[PDB]
């Protein structure tokens, strides 16, 4: 409790058709977007009784992004934040600068839930529309591997799951 705040690191252990693939770790920018970082962090630990463990990446577009976090409906129509209701766009300080950016999916202004995406390219046209709140720290190669199972319409050709997740 005497330490300065450190941006949390969380991990996903990814599986492909049930076969362990590897671990992706993320830095969450709690210093810039504390409410948005906290949502993701707690969903990743499962400490509130729900979150990402066992959920899938339902939409993967090679060259663009991997989208997941729909732990309720498994298809992009669900998800829930830790706050109950969808929550606000905290800020747009951080931009979509390149591969590895972690950003919130949404359905328009102030509609953040649990769905998120991991960029595999620079996606600057999302700036000011999606809240960037973290970045891949380790295991970007695992993201690259999983991205190969996507397709132009986003449908995955193998089932990509978060077998385990938590905080490092």
Coordinates of N, CA and C in Angstrom, one line a residue:
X1 N 0.8 -1.2 0.0 CA 0.0 0.0 0.0 C 0.8 1.3 0.0
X2 N 2.1 1.2 0.2 CA 3.0 2.4 0.1 C 3.5 2.6 -1.3
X3 N 3.4 1.6 -2.2 CA 3.9 1.8 -3.5 C 3.1 2.7 -4.4
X4 N 3.7 3.4 -5.3 CA 3.0 4.1 -6.3 C 2.2 3.2 -7.1
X5 N 1.1 3.7 -7.7 CA 0.3 2.9 -8.6 C 1.1 2.4 -9.8
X6 N 0.9 1.1 -10.1 CA 1.6 0.5 -11.3 C 0.5 0.1 -12.2
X7 N 0.6 0.3 -13.5 CA -0.4 -0.2 -14.4 C -0.4 -1.7 -14.3
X8 N -1.6 -2.3 -14.2 CA -1.7 -3.7 -14.0 C -1.3 -4.4 -15.3
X9 N -0.8 -5.6 -15.1 CA -0.6 -6.6 -16.2 C -1.5 -7.7 -16.0
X10 N -2.2 -8.1 -17.1 CA -3.1 -9.2 -17.1 C -2.7 -10.2 -18.2
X11 N -3.1 -11.4 -18.1 CA -2.8 -12.4 -19.1 C -4.0 -13.1 -19.6
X12 N -4.0 -13.6 -20.8 CA -4.9 -14.6 -21.4 C -4.0 -15.8 -21.8
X13 N -4.5 -17.0 -21.4 CA -4.0 -18.2 -22.0 C -5.0 -18.6 -23.1
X14 N -4.5 -18.6 -24.3 CA -5.3 -18.9 -25.5 C -5.3 -20.3 -25.9
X15 N -6.4 -20.9 -26.3 CA -6.5 -22.2 -26.9 C -7.1 -22.1 -28.2
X16 N -6.8 -23.1 -29.1 CA -7.3 -23.2 -30.5 C -7.9 -24.6 -30.6
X17 N -9.2 -24.7 -30.8 CA -9.9 -26.0 -30.8 C -9.5 -26.7 -29.5
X18 N -9.4 -26.1 -28.4 CA -9.0 -26.7 -27.2 C -7.6 -27.0 -26.9
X19 N -6.7 -26.8 -27.9 CA -5.3 -27.0 -27.8 C -4.6 -25.8 -27.3
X20 N -3.9 -25.8 -26.2 CA -3.2 -24.6 -25.8 C -2.3 -24.0 -26.8
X21 N -2.4 -22.7 -27.0 CA -1.6 -22.0 -28.0 C -0.5 -21.2 -27.3
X22 N -0.8 -20.3 -26.4 CA 0.1 -19.6 -25.6 C -0.5 -18.5 -24.8
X23 N 0.3 -17.7 -24.3 CA -0.1 -16.6 -23.4 C 0.2 -15.2 -24.0
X24 N -0.9 -14.4 -23.9 CA -0.8 -13.0 -24.3 C -0.9 -12.2 -22.9
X25 N 0.1 -11.3 -22.7 CA 0.0 -10.4 -21.6 C -0.3 -9.0 -22.0
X26 N -0.9 -8.2 -21.2 CA -1.3 -6.8 -21.5 C -0.9 -5.9 -20.4
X27 N -0.4 -4.7 -20.7 CA -0.4 -3.6 -19.8 C -1.7 -2.8 -19.9
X28 N -2.3 -2.5 -18.8 CA -3.6 -1.7 -18.8 C -3.2 -0.3 -18.3
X29 N -3.7 0.7 -19.0 CA -3.3 2.0 -18.8 C -4.2 2.7 -17.7
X30 N -4.1 2.2 -16.5 CA -4.9 2.7 -15.4 C -4.5 4.1 -15.0
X31 N -3.3 4.5 -15.3 CA -2.9 5.9 -15.2 C -3.6 6.8 -16.0
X32 N -4.1 6.5 -17.2 CA -4.9 7.3 -18.1 C -6.4 7.1 -18.1
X33 N -6.8 5.8 -18.0 CA -8.2 5.4 -18.1 C -8.5 4.4 -17.0
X34 N -8.5 4.9 -15.8 CA -8.7 4.0 -14.6 C -9.9 3.2 -14.6
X35 N -11.1 3.8 -15.0 CA -12.3 3.1 -14.9 C -12.4 2.0 -16.0
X36 N -11.9 2.3 -17.2 CA -11.9 1.3 -18.3 C -10.8 0.2 -18.0
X37 N -9.7 0.6 -17.5 CA -8.7 -0.4 -17.2 C -9.2 -1.4 -16.1
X38 N -9.9 -0.9 -15.1 CA -10.4 -1.6 -14.0 C -11.4 -2.6 -14.4
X39 N -12.3 -2.2 -15.3 CA -13.3 -3.2 -15.9 C -12.5 -4.4 -16.5
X40 N -11.6 -4.1 -17.4 CA -10.9 -5.2 -18.0 C -10.1 -6.1 -17.0
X41 N -9.5 -5.4 -16.1 CA -8.6 -6.1 -15.1 C -9.5 -7.1 -14.3
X42 N -10.7 -6.6 -13.8 CA -11.5 -7.4 -12.9 C -12.2 -8.5 -13.8
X43 N -12.6 -8.3 -15.0 CA -13.1 -9.3 -15.9 C -12.0 -10.4 -16.1
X44 N -10.8 -10.0 -16.2 CA -9.7 -10.9 -16.4 C -9.4 -11.8 -15.2
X45 N -9.5 -11.3 -14.0 CA -9.3 -12.0 -12.8 C -10.5 -12.9 -12.4
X46 N -11.6 -12.5 -12.8 CA -12.8 -13.2 -12.4 C -13.2 -12.9 -11.0
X47 N -12.6 -12.0 -10.3 CA -12.7 -11.8 -8.9 C -14.0 -11.4 -8.4
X48 N -14.9 -10.9 -9.3 CA -16.3 -10.6 -9.0 C -17.3 -11.7 -9.3
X49 N -16.8 -12.8 -9.8 CA -17.7 -13.9 -10.1 C -18.0 -14.1 -11.5
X50 N -17.4 -13.3 -12.4 CA -17.7 -13.4 -13.9 C -16.6 -12.7 -14.6
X51 N -16.5 -13.0 -15.9 CA -15.5 -12.4 -16.7 C -15.1 -13.3 -17.9
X52 N -13.9 -13.1 -18.3 CA -13.5 -13.6 -19.6 C -13.1 -15.1 -19.6
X53 N -12.9 -15.7 -18.5 CA -12.4 -17.1 -18.5 C -13.4 -18.0 -19.2
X54 N -13.0 -18.7 -20.3 CA -13.8 -19.6 -21.0 C -14.5 -19.0 -22.2
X55 N -14.4 -17.7 -22.4 CA -15.0 -17.0 -23.5 C -14.1 -17.1 -24.8
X56 N -14.7 -16.7 -25.9 CA -14.1 -16.8 -27.2 C -13.7 -15.5 -27.9
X57 N -12.9 -15.5 -28.8 CA -12.7 -14.4 -29.8 C -13.6 -14.8 -30.9
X58 N -14.7 -14.1 -31.1 CA -15.7 -14.4 -32.0 C -15.5 -13.8 -33.4
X59 N -14.8 -12.7 -33.5 CA -14.6 -12.0 -34.8 C -13.1 -11.6 -34.9
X60 N -12.5 -12.2 -35.9 CA -11.1 -12.0 -36.2 C -11.0 -11.7 -37.7
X61 N -10.4 -10.6 -38.0 CA -10.2 -10.1 -39.3 C -8.7 -9.9 -39.5
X62 N -8.1 -10.8 -40.3 CA -6.6 -10.8 -40.4 C -6.2 -9.4 -41.1
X63 N -5.2 -8.9 -40.6 CA -4.7 -7.6 -41.0 C -5.3 -6.4 -40.2
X64 N -6.3 -6.7 -39.4 CA -7.1 -5.6 -38.7 C -7.1 -5.8 -37.2
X65 N -7.9 -6.8 -36.7 CA -8.1 -6.9 -35.3 C -8.7 -8.3 -34.9
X66 N -8.5 -8.6 -33.7 CA -9.1 -9.7 -33.0 C -10.1 -9.2 -31.9
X67 N -11.3 -9.6 -32.0 CA -12.3 -9.1 -31.1 C -12.9 -10.2 -30.2
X68 N -13.0 -9.9 -28.9 CA -13.5 -10.9 -28.0 C -14.2 -10.1 -26.8
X69 N -14.5 -10.9 -25.7 CA -15.0 -10.3 -24.6 C -16.5 -10.5 -24.4
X70 N -17.2 -11.1 -25.4 CA -18.6 -11.4 -25.3 C -18.8 -12.7 -24.5
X71 N -18.7 -12.6 -23.2 CA -18.8 -13.8 -22.3 C -20.2 -14.2 -22.1
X72 N -21.2 -13.4 -22.5 CA -22.6 -13.7 -22.2 C -23.3 -14.4 -23.4
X73 N -23.0 -14.0 -24.6 CA -23.7 -14.5 -25.8 C -22.8 -15.1 -26.8
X74 N -21.5 -14.9 -26.7 CA -20.4 -15.6 -27.4 C -20.4 -15.3 -28.9
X75 N -21.0 -14.2 -29.3 CA -21.2 -13.9 -30.7 C -21.1 -12.4 -31.1
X76 N -20.8 -11.5 -30.1 CA -20.8 -10.1 -30.4 C -22.0 -9.3 -30.0
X77 N -23.1 -10.0 -29.6 CA -24.3 -9.3 -29.2 C -24.4 -9.1 -27.7
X78 N -23.5 -9.7 -26.9 CA -23.6 -9.6 -25.4 C -22.4 -8.9 -24.7
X79 N -22.1 -9.4 -23.6 CA -21.1 -8.8 -22.7 C -21.8 -7.9 -21.6
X80 N -21.0 -7.7 -20.6 CA -21.5 -6.9 -19.5 C -20.2 -6.4 -18.8
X81 N -20.3 -5.1 -18.4 CA -19.2 -4.5 -17.6 C -19.4 -4.8 -16.2
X82 N -18.4 -4.5 -15.4 CA -18.5 -4.7 -13.9 C -19.3 -3.7 -13.3
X83 N -19.8 -2.7 -14.0 CA -20.5 -1.6 -13.4 C -22.0 -1.8 -13.5
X84 N -22.5 -2.9 -14.2 CA -23.9 -3.3 -14.4 C -24.1 -2.8 -15.8
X85 N -24.5 -1.6 -15.9 CA -24.9 -1.0 -17.1 C -23.6 -0.8 -17.9
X86 N -23.8 -0.6 -19.2 CA -22.8 -0.1 -20.1 C -22.3 1.2 -19.5
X87 N -21.0 1.6 -19.8 CA -20.5 2.7 -19.3 C -19.9 3.7 -20.3
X88 N -19.6 4.8 -19.8 CA -19.2 6.0 -20.6 C -17.8 5.7 -21.3
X89 N -17.5 6.5 -22.4 CA -16.2 6.7 -22.9 C -15.4 7.6 -22.0
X90 N -14.5 7.0 -21.3 CA -13.8 7.7 -20.2 C -13.0 8.9 -20.8
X91 N -12.2 8.7 -21.8 CA -11.5 9.7 -22.6 C -11.0 9.1 -23.8
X92 N -10.5 9.9 -24.7 CA -9.8 9.4 -25.9 C -8.4 9.9 -26.0
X93 N -7.7 9.9 -24.8 CA -6.3 10.4 -24.8 C -5.5 9.5 -25.6
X94 N -5.6 8.2 -25.5 CA -4.7 7.3 -26.3 C -5.3 7.0 -27.6
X95 N -4.4 6.8 -28.6 CA -4.7 6.6 -30.0 C -4.4 5.1 -30.4
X96 N -5.0 4.8 -31.6 CA -4.8 3.4 -32.1 C -3.5 3.6 -33.0
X97 N -2.4 3.3 -32.4 CA -1.1 3.7 -33.1 C -0.4 2.5 -33.8
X98 N -0.9 1.3 -33.6 CA -0.3 0.1 -34.2 C -0.7 -1.2 -33.7
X99 N 0.0 -2.2 -34.1 CA -0.3 -3.5 -33.6 C -0.2 -3.6 -32.1
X100 N -1.0 -4.4 -31.4 CA -1.0 -4.6 -30.0 C -1.9 -3.7 -29.2
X101 N -2.4 -2.7 -29.8 CA -3.3 -1.8 -29.0 C -4.6 -2.6 -28.6
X102 N -5.0 -2.4 -27.4 CA -6.1 -2.9 -26.8 C -7.2 -1.8 -26.6
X103 N -8.4 -2.0 -27.1 CA -9.3 -0.9 -27.3 C -10.7 -1.5 -27.0
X104 N -11.7 -0.7 -26.5 CA -13.0 -1.1 -26.3 C -13.9 -1.2 -27.5
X105 N -14.6 -2.3 -27.8 CA -15.6 -2.3 -28.7 C -16.8 -1.6 -28.2
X106 N -17.7 -1.2 -29.1 CA -18.9 -0.5 -28.6 C -19.9 -0.4 -29.7
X107 N -21.1 0.1 -29.4 CA -22.2 0.3 -30.4 C -22.5 1.8 -30.5
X108 N -21.5 2.6 -30.4 CA -21.7 4.1 -30.4 C -21.3 4.7 -29.2
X109 N -21.4 6.0 -29.0 CA -20.9 6.8 -27.9 C -21.4 6.2 -26.6
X110 N -20.6 6.1 -25.6 CA -20.9 5.7 -24.2 C -21.7 4.4 -24.1
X111 N -21.2 3.4 -24.8 CA -21.8 2.1 -24.7 C -20.8 1.0 -24.5
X112 N -19.8 1.2 -23.6 CA -18.8 0.2 -23.3 C -19.4 -0.9 -22.4
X113 N -19.1 -2.1 -22.7 CA -19.5 -3.3 -21.9 C -18.3 -4.1 -21.5
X114 N -18.1 -5.2 -22.1 CA -17.0 -6.1 -21.9 C -16.2 -6.4 -23.2
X115 N -16.8 -6.2 -24.3 CA -16.1 -6.5 -25.6 C -15.0 -5.6 -25.9
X116 N -13.9 -6.1 -26.4 CA -12.7 -5.4 -26.7 C -12.1 -6.0 -27.9
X117 N -11.1 -5.3 -28.5 CA -10.4 -5.8 -29.6 C -8.9 -5.5 -29.4
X118 N -8.1 -6.3 -30.1 CA -6.6 -6.2 -30.1 C -6.3 -6.0 -31.5
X119 N -5.7 -4.8 -31.8 CA -5.3 -4.4 -33.1 C -4.1 -5.2 -33.6
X120 N -4.1 -5.5 -34.9 CA -3.0 -6.2 -35.5 C -2.4 -5.2 -36.6
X121 N -2.8 -4.0 -36.6 CA -2.3 -3.0 -37.5 C -2.7 -1.7 -36.9
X122 N -2.2 -0.6 -37.5 CA -2.6 0.8 -37.1 C -4.0 1.0 -37.6
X123 N -4.9 1.4 -36.7 CA -6.3 1.6 -37.0 C -6.8 3.0 -36.6
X124 N -6.2 4.0 -37.2 CA -6.3 5.4 -36.8 C -7.7 5.9 -37.0
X125 N -8.5 5.3 -37.9 CA -9.9 5.8 -38.1 C -10.8 5.4 -36.9
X126 N -10.3 4.7 -36.0 CA -11.0 4.4 -34.7 C -10.7 5.5 -33.6
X127 N -9.8 6.3 -33.8 CA -9.4 7.3 -32.8 C -10.6 8.2 -32.6
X128 N -10.9 8.4 -31.3 CA -12.0 9.2 -30.9 C -13.3 8.5 -30.9
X129 N -13.4 7.3 -31.3 CA -14.6 6.5 -31.3 C -14.5 5.3 -30.4
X130 N -13.3 4.7 -30.1 CA -13.1 3.6 -29.3 C -12.0 4.0 -28.3
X131 N -12.3 3.7 -27.0 CA -11.3 4.0 -25.9 C -10.2 3.0 -25.9
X132 N -9.0 3.5 -26.2 CA -7.8 2.7 -26.0 C -7.4 2.7 -24.5
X133 N -7.1 1.5 -24.0 CA -6.9 1.3 -22.6 C -5.8 0.4 -22.3
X134 N -5.1 -0.2 -23.2 CA -3.9 -1.1 -22.9 C -3.2 -1.4 -24.2
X135 N -2.2 -2.3 -24.0 CA -1.4 -2.8 -25.1 C -0.8 -4.1 -24.8
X136 N -0.7 -4.9 -25.8 CA 0.1 -6.2 -25.6 C 1.5 -5.9 -25.1
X137 N 1.9 -6.6 -24.1 CA 3.2 -6.5 -23.5 C 4.1 -7.7 -23.9
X138 N 3.6 -8.9 -23.9 CA 4.3 -10.1 -24.3 C 3.3 -11.0 -25.0
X139 N 3.8 -11.8 -25.9 CA 2.9 -12.7 -26.6 C 2.2 -12.1 -27.8
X140 N 2.7 -11.0 -28.4 CA 2.1 -10.6 -29.6 C 2.2 -11.6 -30.7
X141 N 3.2 -12.5 -30.6 CA 3.2 -13.7 -31.6 C 2.1 -14.6 -31.4
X142 N 1.5 -14.7 -30.3 CA 0.3 -15.5 -30.0 C -0.9 -14.9 -30.7
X143 N -1.0 -13.6 -30.5 CA -2.1 -12.8 -31.3 C -1.9 -13.1 -32.8
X144 N -0.7 -13.0 -33.3 CA -0.5 -13.2 -34.7 C -0.9 -14.6 -35.1
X145 N -0.6 -15.6 -34.3 CA -1.0 -16.9 -34.6 C -2.5 -17.1 -34.6
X146 N -3.1 -16.5 -33.6 CA -4.6 -16.7 -33.6 C -5.3 -16.0 -34.7
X147 N -4.7 -14.8 -35.1 CA -5.3 -14.1 -36.2 C -5.4 -14.8 -37.5
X148 N -4.5 -15.8 -37.7 CA -4.6 -16.6 -38.9 C -5.8 -17.4 -39.1
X149 N -6.5 -17.6 -38.0 CA -7.8 -18.4 -38.0 C -9.0 -17.6 -38.2
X150 N -8.8 -16.3 -38.5 CA -9.9 -15.4 -38.9 C -10.1 -15.4 -40.4
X151 N -10.9 -14.5 -40.9 CA -11.3 -14.5 -42.3 C -11.8 -13.1 -42.6
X152 N -12.0 -12.8 -43.8 CA -12.4 -11.5 -44.2 C -13.7 -11.0 -43.6
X153 N -14.7 -11.9 -43.4 CA -15.9 -11.5 -42.8 C -15.9 -11.7 -41.2
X154 N -14.8 -12.1 -40.7 CA -14.6 -12.2 -39.3 C -14.8 -13.5 -38.7
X155 N -15.4 -14.4 -39.4 CA -15.7 -15.7 -38.9 C -14.5 -16.5 -38.7
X156 N -14.3 -17.2 -37.5 CA -13.2 -17.9 -37.3 C -13.3 -19.4 -37.8
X157 N -12.2 -20.0 -38.3 CA -12.2 -21.3 -38.8 C -11.8 -22.4 -37.8
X158 N -11.4 -21.9 -36.6 CA -11.2 -22.8 -35.5 C -11.7 -22.0 -34.3
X159 N -12.0 -22.7 -33.2 CA -12.6 -22.0 -32.0 C -11.4 -21.4 -31.2
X160 N -11.4 -20.1 -31.0 CA -10.3 -19.4 -30.3 C -10.8 -19.0 -28.9
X161 N -10.3 -19.6 -27.9 CA -10.8 -19.4 -26.5 C -9.8 -18.9 -25.6
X162 N -10.3 -18.2 -24.6 CA -9.5 -17.7 -23.4 C -9.7 -18.9 -22.4
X163 N -8.7 -19.8 -22.4 CA -8.7 -21.0 -21.5 C -8.5 -20.6 -20.1
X164 N -7.7 -19.6 -19.8 CA -7.5 -19.1 -18.5 C -7.1 -17.6 -18.6
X165 N -7.2 -16.9 -17.6 CA -6.9 -15.4 -17.6 C -6.7 -15.0 -16.1
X166 N -6.0 -13.9 -15.9 CA -5.7 -13.4 -14.6 C -4.8 -12.3 -14.6
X167 N -4.3 -12.0 -13.4 CA -3.4 -10.8 -13.2 C -2.1 -11.3 -12.8
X168 N -1.1 -10.8 -13.4 CA 0.4 -11.1 -13.1 C 0.8 -10.1 -12.1

